[PDB]
Design a protein around this ligand. Structure first.
Ligand code: LLL
Ligand code: LLL
Ligand code: LLL
Ligand code: MG
Ligand code: MG
Ligand code: MG
Ligand code: MG
Ligand code: MG
Ligand code: MG
Ligand code: MG
Ligand code: MG
Ligand code: MG
Ligand code: MG
Ligand code: MG
Ligand code: MG
Ligand code: MG
Ligand code: MG
Ligand code: MG
Ligand code: MG
Ligand code: MG
Ligand code: MG
Ligand code: MG
Ligand code: MG
Ligand code: MG
Ligand code: MG
Ligand code: MG
Ligand code: MG
Ligand code: MG
Ligand code: MG
Ligand code: MG
Ligand code: MG
Ligand code: MG
Ligand code: MG
Ligand code: MG
Ligand code: MG
Ligand code: MG
Ligand code: MG
Ligand code: MG
Ligand code: MG
Ligand code: MG
Ligand code: MG
Ligand code: MG
Ligand code: MG
Ligand code: MG
Ligand code: MG
Ligand code: MG
Ligand code: MG
Ligand code: MG
Ligand code: MG
Ligand code: MG
Ligand code: MG
Ligand code: MG
Ligand code: MG
Ligand code: MG
Ligand code: MG
Ligand code: MG
Ligand code: MG
Ligand code: MG
Ligand code: MG
Ligand code: MG
Ligand code: MG
Ligand code: MG
Ligand code: MG
Ligand code: MG
Ligand code: MG
Ligand code: MG
Ligand code: MG
Ligand code: MG
Ligand code: MG
Ligand code: MG
Ligand code: MG
Ligand code: MG
Ligand code: MG
Ligand code: MG
Ligand code: MG
Ligand code: MG
Ligand code: MG
Ligand code: MG
Ligand code: MG
Ligand code: MG
Ligand code: MG
Ligand code: MG
Ligand code: MG
Ligand code: MG
Ligand code: MG
Ligand code: MG
Ligand code: MG
Ligand code: MG
Ligand code: MG
Ligand code: MG
Ligand code: MG
Ligand code: MG
Ligand code: MG
Ligand code: MG
Ligand code: MG
Ligand code: MG
Ligand code: MG
Ligand code: MG
Ligand code: MG
Ligand code: MG
Ligand code: MG
Ligand code: MG
Ligand code: MG
Ligand code: MG
Ligand code: MG
Ligand code: MG
Ligand code: MG
Ligand code: MG
Ligand code: MG
Ligand code: MG
Ligand code: MG
Ligand code: MG
Ligand code: MG
Ligand code: MG
Ligand code: MG
Ligand code: MG
Ligand code: MG
Ligand code: MG
Ligand code: MG
Ligand code: MG
Ligand code: MG
Ligand code: MG
Ligand code: MG
Ligand code: MG
Ligand code: MG
Ligand code: MG
Ligand code: MG
Ligand code: MG
Ligand code: MG
Ligand code: MG
Ligand code: MG
Ligand code: MG
Ligand code: MG
Ligand code: MG
Ligand code: MG
Ligand code: MG
Ligand code: MG
Ligand code: MG
Ligand code: MG
Ligand code: MG
Ligand code: ZN
Lengths: 50, 126, 119, 87, 146, 206
RNA sequence: AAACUUUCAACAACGGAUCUCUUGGUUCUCGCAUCGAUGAAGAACGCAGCGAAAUGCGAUACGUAAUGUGAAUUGCAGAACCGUGAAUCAUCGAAUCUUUGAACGCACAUUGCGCCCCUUGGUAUUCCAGGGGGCAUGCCUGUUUGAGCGUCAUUU
RNA sequence: CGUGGAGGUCAGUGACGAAGCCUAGACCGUAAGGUCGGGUCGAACGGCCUCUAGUGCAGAUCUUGGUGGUAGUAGCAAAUAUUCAAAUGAGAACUUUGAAGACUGAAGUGGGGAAAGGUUCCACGUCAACAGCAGUUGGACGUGGGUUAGUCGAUCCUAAGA
RNA sequence: GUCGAAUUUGGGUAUAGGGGCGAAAGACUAAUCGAACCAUCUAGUAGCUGGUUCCUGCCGAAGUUUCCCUCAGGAUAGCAG
RNA sequence: AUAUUGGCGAGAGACCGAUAGCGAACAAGUACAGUGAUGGAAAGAUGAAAAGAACUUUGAAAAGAGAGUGAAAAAGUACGUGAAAUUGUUGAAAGGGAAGGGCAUUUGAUCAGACA
RNA sequence: UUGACCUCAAAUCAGGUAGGAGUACCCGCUGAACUUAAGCAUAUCAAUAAGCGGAGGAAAAGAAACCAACCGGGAUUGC
């Protein structure tokens, strides 16, 4: 950690990208049931387990 | 009743079949009936609705109104007519969704294919 | 607009390879545009075409190499029939129906005879 | 002692990520995944393990190939392509 | 676990017997499934009768020796006495069993007669042309009871 | 049978201040530490779980069956039972109603519906269609959505097409004389169904 | 006497029972016989004008080719028909199919490290870089090529 | 007596309001219960003859969910410590700036790293939740930017070991 | 108490459940050890403890006999419908 | 001919009806826990239609009060019905170390039927 | 000197093939204890669970070294 395997870095890249809220236009779609992004993630809440 | 062992009277299987049906299957679900005058003209009772068709609301609040169909909204199982609208209290206006089974076709939009389909059904075509 | 399939399948190998660099070069210019602009759905159609071009370029050289390999034992695997791994090993119609010399004579002399009853 | 103070000592990985199943069941030292059994030639599963079976068998994934087989069979594994009709 | 005046029962469910339960819900389902597959043989089988001719036979033991029912096949001895080859009589829809033996003239006689009666009641379609369309009979053993 | 036992839970045993039903392992999910397997437990297996080897069909003695239908037939005369059963027969010519063998050959609903009406079946044919109602219960999920009364039983001798002719009129049922079904002759085990006998049928009876 | 307490009612809270809903589950029956070294099952990481996810897909990436239908898609923006043509359509026979996995150049807690054939480039069979095609194992039939006073004839 | 469902029936009740819920309102039953009014409500439901069972709860330190009294209570008191003015803001005991009083006292409360985390870094915005007072402040929320090597590491080598 | 050594300590590496490891306490082996943890056999068995859901009507007990590795249980007779 | 809690395609039930039915009717083997093997949830319903409440006004704001839409806001994205425990207000009645219960009657409140 | 033969090897030799997945049903191996016996060891659970190998749309079995004792029967599987 802070000398990272690129494998670990890449999972950690994909980490960041999932870390954003709902794009709020999905809320507008016909039929659409998603109120909020319920899979969100915090660095000091719950941990990534490598 | 159904005599075919390949037909299903299952209410559940049907309600799913309907709500899951894709675009191409919905067009035929979105049939509207031909007008009394248009029935005798083409020798056809009803056809799957099409965008630029002209049509007459025969049921509901807007019954008696008529216009050109602005869009067929297949996702919503709804057909929108551009005359019929509601005005909101901001003063804007929004389409009213209409179901073809509650419409009737005054004026078809004729294509080579729409024409073909009528004769292909045994029609007339003025 | 945006490319049509049958209009590509006419063109020459050397034209297609050239129009490819067109679409890449057009797409590249659009890429630089798209970050200056609040949206650019145009890019969808150029890059969907760089696929359609490439499909045909490939389509040819395959149906080309398919042709010179035609009708001979041992041609390349991806031009070989897929079917099922297990069908691929099936006994061919010839060697299933291969019958026995001893047994052949018997199917001849003593075949199943059609017949019925009541009279 | 055996409690919370001894827990401050835990910074070491018994397992990193298994290449085969992408798990972090891959025991660093034993160099074998406690979940899928990689390196093993076959994939670890047991009959007292019905759930974990259910969690991994065919169909929990993409089925990038097997998806279509049932269709290709319905058509008898047609080769070539289709010609034309009308309209 | 022993009380009143009742027979001793030996009710055998001490293994996991609930695993090996077999219920026939397909009783009807299989009757149909096998009626179609009979009448779909009656087609694919052409005018042929749907069964094979069976011999008269005296039933074994002392209990059933009194009676007689259809045996398996016709004893090369009878196939020759009725005057045809075995290998051919196979393709005439006669069943020939090479294991059976004739210790009984009265049964051997009975079986040869039964054999000629079949040759007389059948029409053998020739190798090539013709086929004077014959309207298949559904049994043999019904035509030729015991 | 797999259902409800699909956890690994086990009793926490006494001394932990909470009751002893099995309890889910692990932690973090909030299902953990919850009563398992128990016939009183949310999610647990139910008491005496139902089995496919329950006795479903019931055997009846052949002669007893036939005695039953026999008694049911004799009630298709005996007007009061037919009247007491529903079946508006107060005006029909006579019990039993026997009808021309020509009925057996009718090819067309309108034609057949007429003959029925003609011979006294109007008030009964119409008792249905008024009697149509939505299923009172929860079966209306289960592909029995509609209640209705039962109309007449047209008993032919040979079917020349009366059968496809009546199959779409409601409440009406058709059956051969060689067969006869006690389920129809005494619907809901109540005697006196309304039977219209083609004269062909009636003499095949004896 | 108030407060407070308790009790009943109305209104309002609290909670989500009840009632009625049902693209789900469950059980029964019927028909069928099709995974993979031609790389499967499974993984990981990617891909959209605007997506986190489910779904779809693979650097040709919510898709390419083919065929059918005949005008949509829709949350906004964008584009847009008497026709080789709309569609987040149907069907699907042709392809693409990243890093992988029985997983096959060697490795792999590494985006670690070789060898061979073709080709471009820097003066270049030899060094450096790009482009392509390649090298696992057991076994079988075969083809070359060999080994052994295991053994046969033959030369002189 | 009552409940889920089933065959039969009353051509039963119902958007002119089914069901359910509410009701120190009314009536029948010895009682399980049954009927009625009013209110609330919104789409289905009952009487009779039969059929059927996953059919009636006060308890099982019963299962699940919900809620009380306890109770504005126990408490929020280790690590010496806070004070003045201005700015900003709707709002300042707590943010910012100045002023002051202090501390850690180089075996640091300083300056970097290993394991570990994974963007917490940094800028802009920003206070519903979080920071058991507060909140204009934050490791929070939103939105973006940021990690540049022939010489530092890995990579190579071998150790125990595999 | 000890504090320059039978010292403290990181990392790598080995040993795994009737097994390990133990300068020996039945200690330690992931808050688990006089036999770890995970799942399954498993709805393990219980002569023992707890519970066991609507109304009314009529009748109405026994704790005694004999036998039992029986003495908190059955068998049996009796009483009861 | 026989087997089939796997696969693919179909038809069905005196089955269950969101604490039921598979664990999962929902982005369910998901969120989450555990070094690991494994463990493993909760969570369906505004309306026919967003018509999802312009506009005014009070407030820093969240909101409130209006107005408005709608058949209904006693449906306001805390969204069908909306019970109970338990809670606020309002009204009624009563309370000398619990509260509630039984027969009976005064007192008040309340409800008939029933005369003709 | 040469050319065989037998045996054994080598090639990135020419071309094929095996692995893994699934495993309800099927062919085999291996294999418990809970439990029942009111104790308990043979026994029972059970030739069951668990572990392992191998298949197919079915598998297996099958045209008798069979069954019988009859006036004999006549591959296999199934009810
Ligand atoms: C999404 N881009 C597409 C482009 O990829 C292509 O799409 C064709 C589409 O036009 C075809 O459509 C055609 O197919 C019919 C086949 N008989 C004939 C008429 C036409 N509808 C589709 N069948 C296949 C797509 N690849 O042609 C049209 C387009 C818009 O440019
Ligand atoms: C009593 N029947 C109820 C029915 O009323 C309804 O209940 C909803 C419930 O589903 C909604 O909640 C739903 O949507 C929420 C969105 N914030 C999250 C939780 C989810 N269950 C509640 N907000 C209101 C209830 N009346 O849907 C669920 C149910 C159990 O069928
Ligand atoms: C429902 N409200 C009641 C209210 O009615 C009353 O209740 C009395 C109770 O105080 C008396 O209780 C006391 O007072 C009596 C007179 N001094 C003597 C007996 C004593 N226990 C009971 N005997 C009668 C109840 N109805 O006081 C208690 C209460 C809860 O407030
Ligand atoms: Mg809807
Ligand atoms: Mg944690
Ligand atoms: Mg952790
Ligand atoms: Mg839908
Ligand atoms: Mg309408
Ligand atoms: Mg509509
Ligand atoms: Mg811990
Ligand atoms: Mg340590
Ligand atoms: Mg270790
Ligand atoms: Mg799937
Ligand atoms: Mg015995
Ligand atoms: Mg089993
Ligand atoms: Mg037969
Ligand atoms: Mg013999
Ligand atoms: Mg079970
Ligand atoms: Mg089981
Ligand atoms: Mg357990
Ligand atoms: Mg279990
Ligand atoms: Mg245990
Ligand atoms: Mg325990
Ligand atoms: Mg306690
Ligand atoms: Mg666990
Ligand atoms: Mg359950
Ligand atoms: Mg009606
Ligand atoms: Mg109900
Ligand atoms: Mg008090
Ligand atoms: Mg209220
Ligand atoms: Mg609420
Ligand atoms: Mg509905
Ligand atoms: Mg179903
Ligand atoms: Mg197969
Ligand atoms: Mg990319
Ligand atoms: Mg899905
Ligand atoms: Mg999508
Ligand atoms: Mg499509
Ligand atoms: Mg691939
Ligand atoms: Mg990888
Ligand atoms: Mg490798
Ligand atoms: Mg290396
Ligand atoms: Mg190269
Ligand atoms: Mg390479
Ligand atoms: Mg009932
Ligand atoms: Mg029930
Ligand atoms: Mg009924
Ligand atoms: Mg009640
Ligand atoms: Mg009553
Ligand atoms: Mg009312
Ligand atoms: Mg009501
Ligand atoms: Mg409604
Ligand atoms: Mg009824
Ligand atoms: Mg009622
Ligand atoms: Mg029950
Ligand atoms: Mg009840
Ligand atoms: Mg109750
Ligand atoms: Mg209850
Ligand atoms: Mg209680
Ligand atoms: Mg509780
Ligand atoms: Mg509280
Ligand atoms: Mg509490
Ligand atoms: Mg307070
Ligand atoms: Mg205090
Ligand atoms: Mg203080
Ligand atoms: Mg304290
Ligand atoms: Mg202090
Ligand atoms: Mg302070
Ligand atoms: Mg200072
Ligand atoms: Mg200062
Ligand atoms: Mg100091
Ligand atoms: Mg600091
Ligand atoms: Mg915080
Ligand atoms: Mg706080
Ligand atoms: Mg505190
Ligand atoms: Mg605090
Ligand atoms: Mg605050
Ligand atoms: Mg501020
Ligand atoms: Mg900061
Ligand atoms: Mg932030
Ligand atoms: Mg370097
Ligand atoms: Mg080893
Ligand atoms: Mg000292
Ligand atoms: Mg063990
Ligand atoms: Mg050992
Ligand atoms: Mg020691
Ligand atoms: Mg120790
Ligand atoms: Mg522990
Ligand atoms: Mg421990
Ligand atoms: Mg133990
Ligand atoms: Mg043990
Ligand atoms: Mg039990
Ligand atoms: Mg137990
Ligand atoms: Mg008495
Ligand atoms: Mg004595
Ligand atoms: Mg005793
Ligand atoms: Mg005892
Ligand atoms: Mg006792
Ligand atoms: Mg007794
Ligand atoms: Mg079955
Ligand atoms: Mg619920
Ligand atoms: Mg559930
Ligand atoms: Mg419930
Ligand atoms: Mg139930
Ligand atoms: Mg659940
Ligand atoms: Mg959702
Ligand atoms: Mg979810
Ligand atoms: Mg609703
Ligand atoms: Mg719904
Ligand atoms: Mg709706
Ligand atoms: Mg407001
Ligand atoms: Mg307001
Ligand atoms: Mg109003
Ligand atoms: Mg209004
Ligand atoms: Mg309402
Ligand atoms: Mg209300
Ligand atoms: Mg409402
Ligand atoms: Mg709103
Ligand atoms: Mg509210
Ligand atoms: Mg509500
Ligand atoms: Mg309440
Ligand atoms: Mg009060
Ligand atoms: Mg007091
Ligand atoms: Mg006092
Ligand atoms: Mg005092
Ligand atoms: Mg007292
Ligand atoms: Mg080599
Ligand atoms: Mg080779
Ligand atoms: Mg295998
Ligand atoms: Mg396997
Ligand atoms: Mg057991
Ligand atoms: Mg025992
Ligand atoms: Mg015992
Ligand atoms: Mg013992
Ligand atoms: Mg096994
Ligand atoms: Mg078969
Ligand atoms: Mg075989
Ligand atoms: Mg035999
Ligand atoms: Mg047998
Ligand atoms: Mg059978
Ligand atoms: Zn793994």
């Amino acid at each position: 950690a802070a000398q990272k395997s690129f494998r670990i870095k890449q999972k950690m890249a994909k980490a960041k990208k999932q870390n954003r809220p709902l794009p709020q236009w999905i809320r507008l779609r016909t039929n659409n049931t998603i109120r909020y992004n319920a899979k969100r993630r915090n660095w000091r809440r719950t941990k990534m387990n490598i | 009743a159904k005599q075919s062992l390949d037909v299903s009277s299952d209410r559940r299987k049907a309600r799913k079949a309907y709500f899951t049906a894709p675009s191409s299957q919905r067009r035929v679900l979105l049939s509207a009936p031909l007008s009394k005058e248009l029935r005798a003209q083409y020798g056809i009772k009803a056809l799957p609705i099409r965008r630029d068709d002209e049509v007459l609301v025969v049921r509901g609040s807007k019954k008696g109104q008529e216009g050109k169909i602005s869009s067929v909204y297949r996702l919503k199982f709804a057909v929108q007519v551009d005359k019929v609208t509601k005005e909101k209290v901001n003063g804007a206006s929004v389409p009213i969704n209409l179901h073809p089974s509650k419409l009737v076709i005054t004026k078809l939009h004729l294509d080579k294919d729409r024409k073909a389909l009528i004769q292909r059904k045994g029609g007339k075509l003025e | 607009a945006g490319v049509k399939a049958y209009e590509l399948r006419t063109k020459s190998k050397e034209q297609l390879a050239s129009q490819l660099v067109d679409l890449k070069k057009e797409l590249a210019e659009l890429k630089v545009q798209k970050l200056s602009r609040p949206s650019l759905p145009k890019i969808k159609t150029v890059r969907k075409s760089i696929a359609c071009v490439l499909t045909v370029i490939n389509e040819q050289q395959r149906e080309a190499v398919r042709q010179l390999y035609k009708g001979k034992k041992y041609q390349p695997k991806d031009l070989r029939a897929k079917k099922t791994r297990a069908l691929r090993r099936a006994l061919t119609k010839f060697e299933a129906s291969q019958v026995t010399e001893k047994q052949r004579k018997k199917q001849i002399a003593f075949p199943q005879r059609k017949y019925a009853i009541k009279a | 002692g055996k409690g919370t103070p001894s827990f401050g000592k835990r910074h070491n990985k018994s397992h990193t990520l298994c290449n085969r199943c992408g798990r972090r069941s891959f025991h660093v030292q034993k160099k074998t995944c406690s979940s899928c059994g990689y390196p093993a030639a076959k994939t670890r599963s047991y009959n007292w393990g019905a759930k974990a079976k259910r969690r991994h068998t065919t169909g929990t994934g993409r089925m990038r190939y097997l998806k279509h087989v049932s269709r290709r069979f319905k058509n008898g594994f047609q080769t070539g392509s289709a010609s034309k009709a009308s309209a | 676990a022993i009380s009143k005046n009742l027979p001793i029962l030996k009710n055998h469910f001490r293994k996991h017997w609930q695993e090996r339960v077999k219920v026939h819900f397909d009783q009807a389902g299989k009757k149909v499934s096998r009626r179609n597959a009979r009448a779909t043989r009656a087609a694919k089988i052409a005018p042929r009768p749907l069964d094979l001719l069976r011999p008269v036979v005296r039933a074994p033991t002392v209990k059933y020796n009194r009676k007689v029912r259809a045996g398996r096949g016709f004893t090369l001895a009878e196939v020759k006495a009725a005057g045809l080859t075995a290998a051919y009589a196979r393709t005439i829809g006669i069943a020939v069993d090479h294991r059976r033996q004739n210790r009984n003239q009265e049964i051997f006689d009975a079986n040869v007669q039964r054999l000629k009666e079949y040759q007389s009641k059948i029409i053998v379609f020739p190798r090539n042309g013709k086929a004077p369309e014959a309207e298949q009979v559904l049994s043999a053993a019904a035509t030729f009871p015991i | 049978e797999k259902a409800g036992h699909q956890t690994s839970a086990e009793s926490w045993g006494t001394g932990r201040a909470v009751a002893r039903i099995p309890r889910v392992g692990g932690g973090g999910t909030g299902r953990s530490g919850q009563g398992a397997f128990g016939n009183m437990c949310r999610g647990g297996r139910m008491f005496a779980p139902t089995k496919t080897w329950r006795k479903w069909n019931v055997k009846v003695n052949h002669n007893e069956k036939r005695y039953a239908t026999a008694s049911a037939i004799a009630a298709t005369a005996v007007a009061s039972l037919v009247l007491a059963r529903g079946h508006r027969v107060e005006k029909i010519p006579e019990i039993p109603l026997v009808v021309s063998t020509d009925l057996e050959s009718i090819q067309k609903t309108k034609e057949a519906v007429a003959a029925l009406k003609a011979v006294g079946a109007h008030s009964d044919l119409l008792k249905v269609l008024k009697s149509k109602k939505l299923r009172a219960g929860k079966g209306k999920y289960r592909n029995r959505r509609w209640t209705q009364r039962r109309g007449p039983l047209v008993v032919y001798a040979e079917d020349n097409g009366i059968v496809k002719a009546l199959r779409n009129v409601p409440g009406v049922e058709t059956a051969n004389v060689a067969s006869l079904n006690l389920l129809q002759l005494a619907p809901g085990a109540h005697l006196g169904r309304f039977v219209i006998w083609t004269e062909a049928a009636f003499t095949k009876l004896d």
